[PDB]
Coordinates of C-alpha atoms in Angstrom, one line a residue:
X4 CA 11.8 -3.3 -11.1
X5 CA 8.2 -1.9 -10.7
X6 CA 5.9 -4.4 -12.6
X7 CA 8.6 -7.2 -12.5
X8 CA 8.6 -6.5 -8.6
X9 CA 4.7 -6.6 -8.7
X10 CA 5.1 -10.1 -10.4
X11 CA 6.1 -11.0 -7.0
X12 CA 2.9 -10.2 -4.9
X13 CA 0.8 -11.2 -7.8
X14 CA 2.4 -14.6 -7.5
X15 CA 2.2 -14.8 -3.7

């Protein structure tokens, strides 16, 4: 969504 899409980049 917003923090659920930042989850990604955090991740990676």
């Amino acid at each position: 969504d917003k923090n659920p899409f930042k989850e990604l980049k955090g991740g990676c």
